[PDB]
Amino acid sequence: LWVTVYYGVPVWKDAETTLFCASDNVWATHACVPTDPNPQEIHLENVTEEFNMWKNNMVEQMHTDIISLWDQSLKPCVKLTPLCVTLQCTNVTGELKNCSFNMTTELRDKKQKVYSLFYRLDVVQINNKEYRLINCNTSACTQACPKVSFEPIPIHYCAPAGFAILKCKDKKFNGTGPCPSVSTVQCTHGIKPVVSTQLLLNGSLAEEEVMIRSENITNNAKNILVQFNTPVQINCTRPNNNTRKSIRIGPGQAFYATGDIIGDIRQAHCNVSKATWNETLGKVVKQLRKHFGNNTIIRFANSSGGDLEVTTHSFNCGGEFFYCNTSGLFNSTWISDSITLPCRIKQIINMWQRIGQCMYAPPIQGVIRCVSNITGLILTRDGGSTNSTTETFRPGGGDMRDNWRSELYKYKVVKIEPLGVAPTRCKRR
Amino acid sequence: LWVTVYYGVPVWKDAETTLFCASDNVWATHACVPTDPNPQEIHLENVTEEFNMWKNNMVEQMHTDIISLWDQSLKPCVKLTPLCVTLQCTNVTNNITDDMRGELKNCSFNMTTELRDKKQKVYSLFYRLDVVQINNKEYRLINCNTSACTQACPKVSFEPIPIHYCAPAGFAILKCKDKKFNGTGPCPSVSTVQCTHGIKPVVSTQLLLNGSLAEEEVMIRSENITNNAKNILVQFNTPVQINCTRPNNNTRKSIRIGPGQAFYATGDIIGDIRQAHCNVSKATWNETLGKVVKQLRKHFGNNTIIRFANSSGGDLEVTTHSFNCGGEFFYCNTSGLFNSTWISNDSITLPCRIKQIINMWQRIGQCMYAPPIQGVIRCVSNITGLILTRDGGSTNSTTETFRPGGGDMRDNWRSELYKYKVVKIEPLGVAPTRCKRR
Amino acid sequence: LWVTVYYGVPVWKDAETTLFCASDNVWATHACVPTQEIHLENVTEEFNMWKNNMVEQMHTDIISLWDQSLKPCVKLTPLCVTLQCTNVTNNITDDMRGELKNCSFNMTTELRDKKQKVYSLFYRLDVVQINKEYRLINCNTSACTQACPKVSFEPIPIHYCAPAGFAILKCKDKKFNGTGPCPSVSTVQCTHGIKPVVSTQLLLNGSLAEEEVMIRSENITNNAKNILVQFNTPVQINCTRPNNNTRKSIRIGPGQAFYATGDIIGDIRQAHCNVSKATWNETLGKVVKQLRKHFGNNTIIRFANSSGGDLEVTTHSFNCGGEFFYCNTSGLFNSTWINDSITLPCRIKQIINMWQRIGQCMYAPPIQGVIRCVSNITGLILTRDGGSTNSTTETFRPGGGDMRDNWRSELYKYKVVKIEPLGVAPTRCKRR
Amino acid sequence: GFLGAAGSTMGAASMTLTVQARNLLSGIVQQLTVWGIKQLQARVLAVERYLRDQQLLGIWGCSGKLICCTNVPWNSSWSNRNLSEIWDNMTWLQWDKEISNYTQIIYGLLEESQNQQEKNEQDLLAL
Amino acid sequence: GFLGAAGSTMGAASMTLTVQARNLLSTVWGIKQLQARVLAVERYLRDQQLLGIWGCSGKLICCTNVPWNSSWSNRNLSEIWDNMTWLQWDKEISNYTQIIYGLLEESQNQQEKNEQDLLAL
Amino acid sequence: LGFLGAAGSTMGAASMTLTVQARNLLSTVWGIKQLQARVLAVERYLRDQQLLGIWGCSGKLICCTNVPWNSSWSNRNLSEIWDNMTWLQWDKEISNYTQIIYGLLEESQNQQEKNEQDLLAL
């Protein structure tokens, strides 16, 4: 009874490695291999292999690569260090400010007196007609460079040789635990890298119901990642009519200032249908009570507090960054028509919670519109002592990795070890 | 008969790859590998091949390589962003002889020193093409309406040296050997060589400089020569020797603009000033145009009159003859060099003219302030080529006017990489043989 | 007989390769992989430490890593401004007087429009009189960066380990001459750990010899080649800077800071350094005892101080604590051979250009508080002179100046070989 | 296709191991920026892994063959299951989980047995 | 030379197959050199893998058990191996390779399963 | 023993430990030192393995060849080589006359392979 050696038998162990893009603006589509068409699937019909939503290297590599690529794409154009000057600002016609200052020209001796429109959120008062921007005591950062776009182009991560990526197909798969069905694929679907806070939008829908996913459900420190079944459509506008003028700073670098308002100034607002949101919240509260008690009071409040990026729903509609209040959505109690939202716009941006480098977004002329579907929520829990039956579930966010854990949950990467041995009564001679 | 497998059969197939160069500077040689002493060459006797010169990826790869090497080299140099001030300039008057009335401007401007809160008053002579009149008079530099740009470091040299694009491991560079070769068409005599010859990265616009002389007749090469919008490359048999020089005697003064940087400027001329005159022989050019029209009549009509003229563009880099004599950029005439109507020892003096702010490789704003070079400059060079362009003229007594041209810089490198195409070898093959396994 | 082919034979040849870093900050240990010995019995092999190749790769790697460590820090361009300076005479010591200078200048704030007036303290080695108005000494060659206070100059050990196909051979000879045959060679995966300290005349925190004092030279007859001395016992020194500097933050622009010396809380004294007298006397006695073999018996061996030149080569220069000392060490090399403590006065310079380069310096920020510091003296770099022959008198002076000789005192028992595992041999077999 | 019959029986997966091995090196469709250095690292790591897998087959005298045999005995303390129930109703993934510890010694027995067999084969050719 | 017998006799080019098979192994000039060397290594390892999976590893010439088809080549052996080069041959058979590759793989897969049970006695 | 533990052992004693030397040949911008040496080691290993594979000699460490020993390379007897010498000197006196061996083995294997298919053609 002597050892025989087999080469190429299918076994795998889980491992961490570096992936690469594939595709057909900021997100580097042109540096990717073209996609691989109709990858066939298999069926491990006798498997009990555990999946893990929360402890894979896929989302970490996604976040690191998106941050590094954002830092790469911001480089080869204008940096606005001489705009940090004193400002003399008044009121228009009380949110917008009419600021006039002194700036350099393309000649090094001559100077000009130009004016621009600045919002309230990105100016502070220095000691009532002497202002400055809020980034002057922390950074000196880069204008968004007006040829690139911020459209979420689809990106497929495709695995090198020696590694394959699997695909969980279980319908009631909560992200952690041994799923009863494991398939494979060559590489992934069209993950769109949107940026969001407490309203996941433009994503993948669910299969039969609305799932509730967490580390443990009995801890008020882990986010509950709700994914919708039916798409809830949100659509909005900026009703102002901005004009863009080109103020030249120096030898070949310009500054795109906000001009005058052509029409009438009205605040930006994003509204959603009342009955659709009511029935979707009803589905969420119907299937969410199975983890917290069958006779409980579920009441929805607004955001807790902190910075403006985590308190408010922040998204990017065509180049203007909205910071909508979303307090008229999460206000209900549960016991056994359009909802408009006042929304404000900020120009200078700290995107990935980083201190030391901001981002200036230029104004875009005309009215801007976008239709989109809400496909997820990032509810948290504010717990208490066990003396009352009410449960306080305030929405939250700010952690960008939870956005890309909404996708890539039915994906894990394995490493193939083709060598294997077996007992046999055959002999080499 | 049965299927048998062979490894390493001589079978090739066309492809493209990333080549590399070797040699024995603004073209970085110290990053390249050294080449071999006693190089090798392999002749493929008794074989055919279907070369094409107008669709090589070698040319685009070379253009990308030269652009990358040129942009890499100027990166550790002086940026000169304090340089354009409101210049106050007066004309030079002192030893003007007739023809340079109004071309050298003596400019006075003031500038940041090593220290920050102190200004120094300096002066420099600038050419007329580098100053634009903002409304003695107030001038400014031409460059900082579009971009501020980098002074070349005074240690790198713009002299072309030969580079040798080798094949990578597993590929082959196939070489043609048929003399009368059109480009598009088969080459009966094909050789395999692991490296190209000494292609010199020379920059010219109308009258292609130092290079390979054709050894057959003067060759007129194009891809759709019938069409009126394709550049017509002409390669000569005998070289046409051309003199160009700068009679002025420049002196460098070094202005310190910051804590570490410096700006080399023109000083004062020690001597008298005259135009940079370019010479070419009458008889040699007459004989060369005679050979060109002789090989042009057959193909373009067996009884034609052939007219030569001068350029009609608007930018200064296509209507002139730019080159790199010594380190000073010339921008010359070529109009009195082409005033002939061919029908069925003197010297032509060309006014060559010098400009310092250089927008080359046809990009909209990354210039280069070329440093002044001290002393007279003299170049002896070979004319080996010519870029022609036919008009939009149809008929009327077979009169075709062949004005010069240029523009795109790829045409200077399809006059040297024409007898080359990269292929990959595919060693796997099956064939009938009497074999069976045991 | 018939030729056979063996694949995997134990032979090697000398070669040069790229060695990767490995570690257990200014020295970036993030790129180094985290971190064994086989004895060889009957092999003797030629060694040489002066034609070595790990020392040059080490020195170039240290220079390039030092350069990439200072990339994202502040440039300190607008500090090149016309200083207006006077002396400082808060109860100054009569020897320390003049050295510290009060200075004041105009410089920009975080806003581009406005300006402020900021005062600071500078040494005489940092300021040059304008020909009372002064200026910085770095505003004449190249304005240079400032060291970030997040990183520190602690010399963490690093290992260089050869890749696959190469081997590192280590001598176990207890009396290794530096060159010549090595009687016992032991291979190893890689080295024991080298602390990349910087010094000029006296080696600090190095590796001791195990049995007696080793003296190594490329050519002991030639005067132009340095002499390396390695100890068997350590000599202890004290760094000392008895002051209370106050670092204050000055904002130079939108998001940048300049840390300047604000004031001294207390008395201002000299920054001396102390070495023991009896231990140095015994160690110098061992040195002069075991130097007489290469030069001859009953020869008068005496020690003089450094000859001259610039401040870095001539004087002892170490970097303990966080600031840069420049010690005289003229009271050490003074004897002539037929609880006291030697105090050496040292002076501090802030603008530092380390690896003998022009046009590339570095500003060292002040360290708040008082600096207490100790280290071992485990080696010296001597340099003789071309004295007259048959005079029975040789003068030895501490040299230095080059940084290769500091790390050649640690990579003296290592060389890299290239494994070629293919070989042929005759054997009586045949192929059927 | 790739990883086909990975949940099937041990005997039926022995007929399939010729299609897993074709994609251990590369695909042909996948043969400066963030992506390029990452893909180059992936290619070099795949080449290293394939060479490391091929080296062990080179040492044990099994080079160029997929299924082979060796002359080392199987100690019964490694596994007690007989031949009838190991090639049927057993998956390769369930088979790998009990030779987690015992692989590093059977590899050494393989290389020592092949070295002894090669020395003995070279001994008889001298006659 | 390297491949100077490319236009030679097909029976005479089989002698010189060794010297063509040794040459498949051999900052702007940084990652470009690296990519070229990795691509050459990938192509050579792909060729050696395709030799190994068909069972003809370690041999420049190998003889197999796949029957030749008259539709693939009606020409007899008196013209292929006497007055016809490898280039004309590969241009003739460039679109017929994949079926022959699959048949070689199938014959090698069927050959090995009939040898494992042979030594089980 | 270890990686090079038999370097002091004789010719007949280091011949039984070739496996431990054959096994260990294939074991933030300045991280390219870790990447370049791996490609160099891969190219060296493929060069050695291909040079073994030309001679009809791959897949085995102790490999025999039917080429006779020309005495001009070395004229000493086989008796005092395999038990009174180590591998380092046997590299030293065959530092020369090696490239001729590396070509005659190439031609011998090619003629043996030619013998192989024309023996099997009949």
Ligand SMILES: *[C@@H]1O[C@H](CO)[C@@H](O[C@@H]2O[C@H](CO)[C@@H](O[C@@H]3O[C@H](CO)[C@@H](O)[C@H](O)[C@@H]3O)[C@H](O)[C@H]2NC(C)=O)[C@H](O)[C@H]1NC(C)=O
């Ligand atoms: C979620 O996805 C939808 C659909 O992909 C996004 O709506 C799209 O938004 C973009 C950006 O504003 C619109 O592009 C713009 O449209 C017009 C005409 O093309 C013009 O102003 C611009 O040139 C630009 O192309 C696009 O039309 C719009 N699509 C539809 C069908 O309305 C939506 O923005 C995404 N939600 C996000 C990113 O939060």
Ligand SMILES: *[C@@H]1O[C@H](CO)[C@@H](O[C@@H]2O[C@H](CO)[C@@H](O[C@@H]3O[C@H](CO)[C@@H](O)[C@H](O)[C@@H]3O)[C@H](O)[C@H]2NC(C)=O)[C@H](O)[C@H]1NC(C)=O
């Ligand atoms: C090289 O360029 C010349 C330009 O002189 C091309 O000749 C012209 O080609 C165009 C486009 O094919 C022809 O126009 C159209 O062609 C067909 C009939 O040929 C028909 O659709 C239209 O009636 C129209 O004419 C044009 O006739 C033709 N000739 C002339 C005298 O202008 C030529 O095709 C190019 N050569 C190659 C090899 O592509």
Ligand SMILES: *[C@@H]1O[C@H](CO)[C@@H](O[C@@H]2O[C@H](CO)[C@@H](O[C@@H]3O[C@H](CO)[C@@H](O)[C@H](O)[C@@H]3O)[C@H](O)[C@H]2NC(C)=O)[C@H](O)[C@H]1NC(C)=O
């Ligand atoms: C075509 O090739 C000729 C080859 O001689 C090139 O002429 C050479 O140009 C270089 C660069 O200016 C001259 O070198 C310089 O010469 C003197 C000392 O001789 C001195 O100023 C410099 O140290 C430098 O070495 C060289 O003399 C000159 N040779 C001749 C014979 O004229 C010519 O430039 C090429 N044509 C081009 C690039 O258009």
Ligand SMILES: *[C@@H]1O[C@H](CO)[C@@H](O[C@@H]2O[C@H](CO)[C@@H](O[C@@H]3O[C@H](CO)[C@@H](O)[C@H](O)[C@@H]3O)[C@H](O)[C@H]2NC(C)=O)[C@H](O)[C@H]1NC(C)=O
């Ligand atoms: C030679 O090695 C000795 C250690 O035996 C080095 O002395 C060490 O000097 C550093 C200076 O940065 C001290 O670290 C710092 O100390 C204090 C807390 O004690 C604080 O400022 C920092 O957090 C930091 O840890 C270290 O304590 C000190 N070791 C001692 C006194 O035992 C010496 O610098 C080395 N010599 C050279 C030339 O590098």
Ligand SMILES: *[C@@H]1O[C@H](CO)[C@@H](O[C@@H]2O[C@H](CO)[C@@H](O)[C@H](O)[C@H]2NC(C)=O)[C@H](O)[C@H]1NC(C)=O
């Ligand atoms: C190409 O043509 C040559 C002739 O130049 C051919 O050489 C023949 O080779 C055979 C075989 O040795 C000789 O018997 C003939 O006498 C040669 N000449 C003929 C047929 O004219 C050869 O077939 C081809 N050779 C190459 C190297 O490509």
Ligand SMILES: *[C@@H]1O[C@H](CO)[C@@H](O)[C@H](O)[C@H]1NC(C)=O
């Ligand atoms: C979740 O929280 C509970 C309650 O504190 C705790 O006992 C449990 O360990 C947590 N779950 C995990 C997986 O850590």
Ligand SMILES: *[C@@H]1O[C@H](CO)[C@@H](O)[C@H](O)[C@H]1NC(C)=O
């Ligand atoms: C997820 O489901 C599994 C069973 O499929 C169960 O063991 C586990 O506790 C669930 N996790 C949570 C967080 O509810």
Ligand SMILES: *[C@@H]1O[C@H](CO)[C@@H](O)[C@H](O)[C@H]1NC(C)=O
């Ligand atoms: C915008 O959404 C509302 C519901 O919130 C819907 O009634 C309306 O038709 C939408 N407008 C579009 C799609 O233009």
Ligand SMILES: *[C@@H]1O[C@H](CO)[C@@H](O)[C@H](O)[C@H]1NC(C)=O
């Ligand atoms: C939600 O809207 C987006 C944007 O128009 C669209 O791509 C998506 O298909 C919609 N979802 C549906 C219809 O389920």
Ligand SMILES: *[C@@H]1O[C@H](CO)[C@@H](O)[C@H](O)[C@H]1NC(C)=O
């Ligand atoms: C200076 O030169 C300009 C440019 O041609 C000309 O218009 C002007 O008249 C000149 N002035 C004098 C005083 O020569």
Ligand SMILES: *[C@@H]1O[C@H](CO)[C@@H](O)[C@H](O)[C@H]1NC(C)=O
């Ligand atoms: C180029 O010459 C070849 C050689 O015969 C010929 O086939 C082809 O037609 C020519 N092309 C042109 C455009 O003259």
Ligand SMILES: *[C@@H]1O[C@H](CO)[C@@H](O)[C@H](O)[C@H]1NC(C)=O
């Ligand atoms: C133009 O050509 C005529 C002859 O055709 C000649 O007289 C005249 O000089 C030419 N012009 C130049 C500048 O050579």
Ligand SMILES: *[C@@H]1O[C@H](CO)[C@@H](O)[C@H](O)[C@H]1NC(C)=O
């Ligand atoms: C020891 O080193 C000295 C100094 O370099 C040298 O002169 C001497 O020859 C060496 N001796 C031996 C035995 O290697």
Ligand SMILES: *[C@@H]1O[C@H](CO)[C@@H](O)[C@H](O)[C@H]1NC(C)=O
């Ligand atoms: C030394 O200076 C520091 C500066 O932070 C101060 O806090 C401390 O009290 C001083 N110590 C003395 C004077 O002993």
Ligand SMILES: *[C@@H]1O[C@H](CO)[C@@H](O)[C@H](O)[C@H]1NC(C)=O
């Ligand atoms: C193999 O090694 C591990 C680690 O020491 C040990 O825990 C385990 O029990 C061993 N396996 C067996 C099957 O004994």
Ligand SMILES: *[C@@H]1O[C@H](CO)[C@@H](O)[C@H](O)[C@H]1NC(C)=O
């Ligand atoms: C070293 O030499 C001695 C004496 O000849 C011998 O006994 C010993 O075995 C040798 N060592 C090795 C490892 O072969």
